[PDB]
Design a protein around this ligand. Structure first.
Ligand SMILES: [Cl-]
Ligand SMILES: [Cl-]
Ligand code: NA
Ligand code: NA
Lengths: 193, 193
Protein backbone atom coordinates (compact mmCIF):
# COMPACT_ATOMS: atom_id res chain seq x y z
CA UNK A 1 0.00 0.00 0.00
CA UNK A 2 1.32 1.50 -2.37
CA UNK A 3 4.19 3.95 -1.75
CA UNK A 4 4.82 3.71 2.04
CA UNK A 5 8.56 3.75 2.60
CA UNK A 6 8.36 0.16 3.85
CA UNK A 7 6.36 -0.92 0.75
CA UNK A 8 8.71 0.73 -1.75
CA UNK A 9 11.61 -1.01 0.00
CA UNK A 10 9.85 -4.41 0.04
CA UNK A 11 8.90 -4.20 -3.69
CA UNK A 12 12.47 -3.03 -4.40
CA UNK A 13 13.91 -6.03 -2.50
CA UNK A 14 11.61 -8.33 -4.56
CA UNK A 15 12.81 -6.58 -7.70
CA UNK A 16 16.45 -6.95 -6.62
CA UNK A 17 15.96 -10.75 -6.49
CA UNK A 18 14.46 -10.75 -9.97
CA UNK A 19 16.93 -8.53 -11.79
CA UNK A 20 20.03 -8.01 -9.62
CA UNK A 21 21.81 -4.80 -8.65
CA UNK A 22 22.92 -3.52 -12.11
CA UNK A 23 19.44 -4.28 -13.56
CA UNK A 24 17.59 -2.63 -10.68
CA UNK A 25 16.31 0.81 -11.77
CA UNK A 26 13.75 3.28 -10.50
CA UNK A 27 11.98 2.93 -13.87
CA UNK A 28 11.34 -0.83 -13.28
CA UNK A 29 10.36 -0.20 -9.62
CA UNK A 30 7.68 2.29 -10.78
CA UNK A 31 6.43 -0.26 -13.29
CA UNK A 32 6.32 -2.95 -10.58
CA UNK A 33 4.48 -0.59 -8.21
CA UNK A 34 1.97 0.49 -10.93
CA UNK A 35 2.88 4.15 -10.65
CA UNK A 36 4.25 6.87 -13.00
CA UNK A 37 7.93 7.73 -12.72
CA UNK A 38 7.37 11.31 -11.38
CA UNK A 39 5.10 9.82 -8.67
CA UNK A 40 7.85 7.48 -7.51
CA UNK A 41 10.56 10.22 -7.86
CA UNK A 42 8.64 12.12 -5.09
CA UNK A 43 9.32 9.17 -2.77
CA UNK A 44 12.68 7.85 -4.07
CA UNK A 45 14.85 10.37 -5.92
CA UNK A 46 17.35 7.97 -7.51
CA UNK A 47 18.91 4.55 -7.56
CA UNK A 48 21.67 5.61 -5.12
CA UNK A 49 18.97 6.61 -2.61
CA UNK A 50 17.18 3.33 -3.24
CA UNK A 51 20.26 1.24 -2.83
CA UNK A 52 21.22 3.05 0.40
CA UNK A 53 17.73 2.23 1.77
CA UNK A 54 17.99 -1.42 0.67
CA UNK A 55 21.37 -1.82 2.40
CA UNK A 56 19.93 -0.57 5.68
CA UNK A 57 16.87 -2.78 5.34
CA UNK A 58 18.78 -5.96 4.61
CA UNK A 59 20.77 -5.56 7.87
CA UNK A 60 17.70 -4.44 9.88
CA UNK A 61 15.71 -7.54 8.83
CA UNK A 62 18.38 -10.21 8.95
CA UNK A 63 21.53 -9.13 10.82
CA UNK A 64 20.22 -10.22 14.20
CA UNK A 65 23.61 -10.73 15.95
CA UNK A 66 24.94 -7.19 15.45
CA UNK A 67 25.44 -6.69 19.21
CA UNK A 68 27.13 -8.81 21.94
CA UNK A 69 25.01 -10.68 24.51
CA UNK A 70 25.32 -10.27 28.28
CA UNK A 71 28.37 -12.15 29.59
CA UNK A 72 29.42 -13.12 26.05
CA UNK A 73 33.14 -13.71 25.27
CA UNK A 74 34.68 -11.47 22.52
CA UNK A 75 35.40 -14.66 20.55
CA UNK A 76 31.75 -15.67 20.54
CA UNK A 77 30.73 -12.15 19.63
CA UNK A 78 32.96 -12.10 16.52
CA UNK A 79 31.96 -15.59 15.52
CA UNK A 80 28.20 -14.92 15.99
CA UNK A 81 28.35 -11.47 14.38
CA UNK A 82 30.31 -12.77 11.38
CA UNK A 83 27.91 -15.67 10.85
CA UNK A 84 24.99 -13.22 11.14
CA UNK A 85 26.47 -10.73 8.72
CA UNK A 86 27.08 -13.52 6.13
CA UNK A 87 23.54 -14.90 6.43
CA UNK A 88 22.09 -11.41 6.09
CA UNK A 89 24.14 -10.71 2.94
CA UNK A 90 23.26 -14.05 1.41
CA UNK A 91 19.46 -13.42 1.70
CA UNK A 92 19.13 -11.24 -1.42
CA UNK A 93 20.68 -11.41 -4.81
CA UNK A 94 23.75 -9.13 -5.07
CA UNK A 95 23.30 -8.47 -1.35
CA UNK A 96 26.99 -7.97 -0.70
CA UNK A 97 27.27 -5.62 -3.65
CA UNK A 98 24.38 -3.57 -2.22
CA UNK A 99 26.12 -3.42 1.15
CA UNK A 100 29.51 -2.48 -0.45
CA UNK A 101 28.12 0.32 -2.61
CA UNK A 102 26.66 2.24 0.35
CA UNK A 103 28.28 4.58 2.89
CA UNK A 104 27.40 3.60 6.49
CA UNK A 105 24.55 5.33 8.32
CA UNK A 106 23.84 6.48 11.90
CA UNK A 107 22.80 2.85 12.69
CA UNK A 108 25.99 1.11 11.50
CA UNK A 109 28.06 3.88 13.15
CA UNK A 110 26.12 3.60 16.46
CA UNK A 111 26.35 -0.21 16.35
CA UNK A 112 30.09 -0.13 15.58
CA UNK A 113 30.58 2.24 18.55
CA UNK A 114 29.04 -0.29 20.95
CA UNK A 115 31.19 -3.03 19.36
CA UNK A 116 34.38 -0.99 19.88
CA UNK A 117 33.41 -0.31 23.51
CA UNK A 118 32.79 -4.04 23.94
CA UNK A 119 36.14 -5.00 22.42
CA UNK A 120 38.06 -2.42 24.45
CA UNK A 121 36.51 -3.66 27.73
CA UNK A 122 37.87 -7.09 26.79
CA UNK A 123 41.47 -5.93 26.61
CA UNK A 124 41.72 -4.68 23.03
CA UNK A 125 43.27 -1.34 22.30
CA UNK A 126 40.94 0.77 20.14
CA UNK A 127 43.08 0.02 17.10
CA UNK A 128 43.30 -3.74 17.49
CA UNK A 129 39.62 -3.83 18.45
CA UNK A 130 38.90 -1.94 15.25
CA UNK A 131 41.31 -4.03 13.10
CA UNK A 132 39.60 -7.15 14.45
CA UNK A 133 36.08 -6.08 13.53
CA UNK A 134 37.21 -4.78 10.11
CA UNK A 135 39.08 -8.04 9.28
CA UNK A 136 36.01 -10.14 10.11
CA UNK A 137 34.02 -7.80 7.91
CA UNK A 138 36.42 -7.93 4.98
CA UNK A 139 36.75 -11.70 5.18
CA UNK A 140 32.98 -12.21 5.38
CA UNK A 141 32.37 -9.78 2.53
CA UNK A 142 34.96 -11.38 0.26
CA UNK A 143 33.55 -14.87 0.87
CA UNK A 144 29.94 -13.85 0.20
CA UNK A 145 30.83 -11.75 -2.80
CA UNK A 146 32.60 -14.77 -4.29
CA UNK A 147 29.64 -17.04 -3.37
CA UNK A 148 27.06 -14.66 -4.94
CA UNK A 149 28.93 -13.80 -8.15
CA UNK A 150 29.51 -17.43 -9.12
CA UNK A 151 41.45 -29.31 -14.69
CA UNK A 152 44.55 -30.27 -12.66
CA UNK A 153 44.98 -33.29 -10.25
CA UNK A 154 45.14 -31.75 -6.77
CA UNK A 155 42.63 -28.94 -7.34
CA UNK A 156 40.18 -31.52 -8.63
CA UNK A 157 40.53 -33.86 -5.67
CA UNK A 158 40.11 -31.06 -3.15
CA UNK A 159 37.10 -29.54 -4.98
CA UNK A 160 34.91 -32.60 -4.34
CA UNK A 161 34.92 -31.12 -0.77
CA UNK A 162 34.69 -27.33 -1.43
CA UNK A 163 31.59 -27.77 -3.65
CA UNK A 164 29.19 -30.05 -1.67
CA UNK A 165 28.46 -26.94 0.40
CA UNK A 166 28.14 -23.23 -0.43
CA UNK A 167 31.21 -21.81 1.22
CA UNK A 168 30.12 -22.17 4.88
CA UNK A 169 32.70 -24.76 5.96
CA UNK A 170 35.64 -22.79 4.51
CA UNK A 171 34.22 -19.56 5.93
CA UNK A 172 33.77 -21.06 9.42
CA UNK A 173 37.26 -22.60 9.35
CA UNK A 174 38.94 -19.34 8.28
CA UNK A 175 37.03 -17.45 10.94
CA UNK A 176 38.44 -19.74 13.68
CA UNK A 177 41.95 -19.28 12.33
CA UNK A 178 41.58 -15.48 12.56
CA UNK A 179 40.02 -15.55 16.06
CA UNK A 180 42.92 -17.71 17.35
CA UNK A 181 45.34 -15.23 15.78
CA UNK A 182 43.64 -12.40 17.64
CA UNK A 183 43.69 -14.47 20.88
CA UNK A 184 47.44 -15.03 20.47
CA UNK A 185 48.17 -11.33 19.74
CA UNK A 186 45.92 -10.25 22.60
CA UNK A 187 47.63 -12.60 25.11
CA UNK A 188 51.22 -11.76 24.03
CA UNK A 189 50.78 -8.08 25.09
CA UNK A 190 54.25 -6.35 24.81
CA UNK A 191 56.16 -9.64 24.24
CA UNK A 192 57.60 -10.87 20.95
CA UNK A 193 55.03 -13.30 19.46
CA UNK B 1 48.67 -0.47 -33.33
CA UNK B 2 45.58 -0.55 -33.57
CA UNK B 3 43.66 -3.77 -32.79
CA UNK B 4 46.39 -6.21 -31.63
CA UNK B 5 45.03 -8.17 -28.68
CA UNK B 6 47.60 -6.48 -26.44
CA UNK B 7 46.61 -3.00 -27.74
CA UNK B 8 42.86 -3.54 -27.29
CA UNK B 9 43.58 -4.69 -23.73
CA UNK B 10 45.87 -1.72 -22.98
CA UNK B 11 43.36 0.85 -24.35
CA UNK B 12 40.62 -0.98 -22.42
CA UNK B 13 42.67 -0.78 -19.18
CA UNK B 14 43.14 2.98 -19.82
CA UNK B 15 39.41 3.27 -20.40
CA UNK B 16 38.67 1.31 -17.22
CA UNK B 17 40.60 3.95 -15.23
CA UNK B 18 38.62 6.74 -16.86
CA UNK B 19 35.10 5.36 -16.58
CA UNK B 20 35.09 2.37 -14.21
CA UNK B 21 33.65 -1.11 -14.69
CA UNK B 22 29.91 -0.29 -15.10
CA UNK B 23 30.76 2.58 -17.51
CA UNK B 24 33.17 0.49 -19.58
CA UNK B 25 31.49 -0.57 -22.84
CA UNK B 26 32.64 -1.92 -26.18
CA UNK B 27 31.03 1.14 -27.79
CA UNK B 28 33.37 3.53 -25.87
CA UNK B 29 36.40 1.26 -26.52
CA UNK B 30 35.72 1.47 -30.29
CA UNK B 31 35.45 5.24 -30.02
CA UNK B 32 38.73 5.38 -28.07
CA UNK B 33 40.44 3.12 -30.62
CA UNK B 34 39.08 5.15 -33.61
CA UNK B 35 37.32 2.17 -35.13
CA UNK B 36 33.71 1.25 -36.09
CA UNK B 37 31.82 -1.05 -33.73
CA UNK B 38 31.61 -4.01 -36.20
CA UNK B 39 35.41 -3.75 -36.66
CA UNK B 40 35.99 -4.07 -32.92
CA UNK B 41 33.27 -6.81 -32.59
CA UNK B 42 35.52 -8.98 -34.86
CA UNK B 43 38.24 -8.75 -32.19
CA UNK B 44 36.19 -8.48 -28.96
CA UNK B 45 32.68 -9.92 -29.09
CA UNK B 46 31.27 -8.40 -25.89
CA UNK B 47 31.94 -6.76 -22.57
CA UNK B 48 32.06 -10.14 -20.76
CA UNK B 49 34.86 -11.22 -23.12
CA UNK B 50 36.60 -7.90 -22.57
CA UNK B 51 36.34 -8.07 -18.83
CA UNK B 52 37.62 -11.67 -18.77
CA UNK B 53 40.67 -10.51 -20.77
CA UNK B 54 41.24 -7.52 -18.46
CA UNK B 55 41.14 -9.75 -15.37
CA UNK B 56 43.83 -12.01 -16.80
CA UNK B 57 45.96 -9.04 -17.84
CA UNK B 58 45.82 -7.28 -14.50
CA UNK B 59 47.23 -10.40 -12.75
CA UNK B 60 49.77 -11.10 -15.54
CA UNK B 61 51.21 -7.56 -15.31
CA UNK B 62 51.16 -6.99 -11.57
CA UNK B 63 50.65 -10.19 -9.56
CA UNK B 64 54.34 -11.02 -9.43
CA UNK B 65 54.30 -13.19 -6.25
CA UNK B 66 51.80 -15.78 -7.49
CA UNK B 67 54.26 -18.65 -6.90
CA UNK B 68 56.46 -19.65 -3.90
CA UNK B 69 60.23 -19.12 -4.02
CA UNK B 70 62.83 -21.85 -3.53
CA UNK B 71 63.18 -22.70 0.18
CA UNK B 72 60.35 -20.31 1.11
CA UNK B 73 58.24 -21.01 4.24
CA UNK B 74 54.44 -21.43 3.66
CA UNK B 75 53.91 -18.40 5.93
CA UNK B 76 56.07 -16.18 3.73
CA UNK B 77 54.36 -17.52 0.63
CA UNK B 78 50.88 -16.57 1.90
CA UNK B 79 52.06 -13.22 3.15
CA UNK B 80 53.92 -12.37 -0.10
CA UNK B 81 51.15 -13.72 -2.35
CA UNK B 82 48.45 -11.82 -0.44
CA UNK B 83 50.40 -8.56 -0.57
CA UNK B 84 50.98 -9.14 -4.30
CA UNK B 85 47.36 -9.91 -5.03
CA UNK B 86 46.24 -6.71 -3.18
CA UNK B 87 48.74 -4.50 -5.02
CA UNK B 88 47.70 -5.99 -8.36
CA UNK B 89 43.99 -5.36 -7.64
CA UNK B 90 44.63 -1.83 -6.46
CA UNK B 91 46.39 -0.83 -9.74
CA UNK B 92 43.22 -0.20 -11.78
CA UNK B 93 39.93 1.36 -10.94
CA UNK B 94 37.32 -1.28 -10.01
CA UNK B 95 40.13 -3.83 -10.26
CA UNK B 96 38.67 -6.12 -7.63
CA UNK B 97 35.26 -5.97 -9.27
CA UNK B 98 36.88 -6.99 -12.58
CA UNK B 99 38.60 -9.91 -10.87
CA UNK B 100 35.35 -10.97 -9.05
CA UNK B 101 33.16 -10.90 -12.16
CA UNK B 102 35.34 -13.40 -14.07
CA UNK B 103 35.55 -17.20 -13.92
CA UNK B 104 39.16 -18.41 -13.49
CA UNK B 105 41.20 -19.50 -16.52
CA UNK B 106 43.82 -22.17 -17.29
CA UNK B 107 46.45 -19.82 -15.74
CA UNK B 108 44.75 -19.27 -12.36
CA UNK B 109 43.87 -23.00 -12.25
CA UNK B 110 47.47 -24.05 -13.12
CA UNK B 111 48.88 -21.56 -10.60
CA UNK B 112 46.48 -22.71 -7.86
CA UNK B 113 47.54 -26.32 -8.54
CA UNK B 114 51.19 -25.49 -7.84
CA UNK B 115 50.10 -23.59 -4.70
CA UNK B 116 48.13 -26.61 -3.42
CA UNK B 117 51.11 -28.90 -4.10
CA UNK B 118 53.30 -26.43 -2.21
CA UNK B 119 50.94 -26.27 0.77
CA UNK B 120 50.52 -30.04 0.93
CA UNK B 121 54.31 -30.61 0.95
CA UNK B 122 54.38 -28.32 4.00
CA UNK B 123 52.04 -30.49 6.03
CA UNK B 124 48.63 -29.20 4.97
CA UNK B 125 45.92 -31.62 3.99
CA UNK B 126 44.47 -30.70 0.59
CA UNK B 127 41.43 -29.22 2.29
CA UNK B 128 43.21 -27.07 4.84
CA UNK B 129 45.73 -26.05 2.19
CA UNK B 130 42.80 -25.02 0.02
CA UNK B 131 40.88 -23.31 2.88
CA UNK B 132 44.05 -21.36 3.68
CA UNK B 133 44.55 -20.02 0.17
CA UNK B 134 40.82 -19.23 -0.22
CA UNK B 135 40.68 -17.35 3.12
CA UNK B 136 43.66 -15.18 2.17
CA UNK B 137 41.92 -14.53 -1.12
CA UNK B 138 38.56 -13.64 0.41
CA UNK B 139 40.15 -11.40 3.04
CA UNK B 140 42.31 -9.60 0.46
CA UNK B 141 39.38 -9.19 -1.91
CA UNK B 142 37.07 -7.81 0.78
CA UNK B 143 39.68 -5.28 1.93
CA UNK B 144 40.44 -4.02 -1.58
CA UNK B 145 36.81 -3.93 -2.61
CA UNK B 146 36.10 -1.76 0.43
CA UNK B 147 39.16 0.43 -0.33
CA UNK B 148 38.18 0.91 -4.01
CA UNK B 149 34.45 1.54 -3.54
CA UNK B 150 34.95 4.30 -0.98
CA UNK B 151 29.98 10.59 14.85
CA UNK B 152 30.48 8.67 18.12
CA UNK B 153 33.41 8.99 20.65
CA UNK B 154 35.38 5.74 20.30
CA UNK B 155 34.94 5.30 16.54
CA UNK B 156 36.19 8.83 16.07
CA UNK B 157 39.30 8.41 18.20
CA UNK B 158 40.27 5.17 16.48
CA UNK B 159 39.64 6.56 12.96
CA UNK B 160 42.48 9.11 13.25
CA UNK B 161 44.60 5.91 12.83
CA UNK B 162 42.61 3.91 10.22
CA UNK B 163 42.55 6.89 7.79
CA UNK B 164 46.17 8.18 7.61
CA UNK B 165 46.81 5.14 5.41
CA UNK B 166 44.76 3.33 2.75
CA UNK B 167 43.98 0.07 4.47
CA UNK B 168 47.48 -1.49 4.35
CA UNK B 169 48.18 -1.53 8.09
CA UNK B 170 44.83 -3.18 8.95
CA UNK B 171 45.24 -5.60 6.05
CA UNK B 172 48.78 -6.58 7.10
CA UNK B 173 47.72 -6.98 10.75
CA UNK B 174 44.72 -9.19 9.88
CA UNK B 175 46.89 -11.28 7.60
CA UNK B 176 49.30 -12.06 10.49
CA UNK B 177 46.40 -13.00 12.73
CA UNK B 178 45.15 -15.51 10.11
CA UNK B 179 48.62 -16.97 9.44
CA UNK B 180 49.16 -17.56 13.19
CA UNK B 181 45.75 -19.25 13.31
CA UNK B 182 46.81 -21.56 10.50
CA UNK B 183 50.15 -22.22 12.26
CA UNK B 184 48.30 -23.18 15.45
CA UNK B 185 45.83 -25.48 13.62
CA UNK B 186 48.65 -27.03 11.60
CA UNK B 187 50.77 -27.74 14.73
CA UNK B 188 47.87 -29.14 16.83
CA UNK B 189 47.35 -32.05 14.36
CA UNK B 190 44.76 -34.48 15.93
CA UNK B 191 44.80 -32.75 19.37
CA UNK B 192 42.09 -30.51 20.79
CA UNK B 193 43.19 -26.89 20.11
CL1 LIG C 1 -2.76 -0.12 -2.60
CL1 LIG D 1 48.02 2.38 -35.74
NA1 NA E 1 29.04 -0.37 3.14
NA1 NA F 1 37.46 -14.39 -10.23
Amino acid sequence: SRLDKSKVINSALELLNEVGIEGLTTRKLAQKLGVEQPTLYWHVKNKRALLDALAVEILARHHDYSLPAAGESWQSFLRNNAMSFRRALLRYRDGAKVHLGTRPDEKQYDTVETQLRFMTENGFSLRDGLYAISWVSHFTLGAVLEQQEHLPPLLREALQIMDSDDGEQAFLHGLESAIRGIEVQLTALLQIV
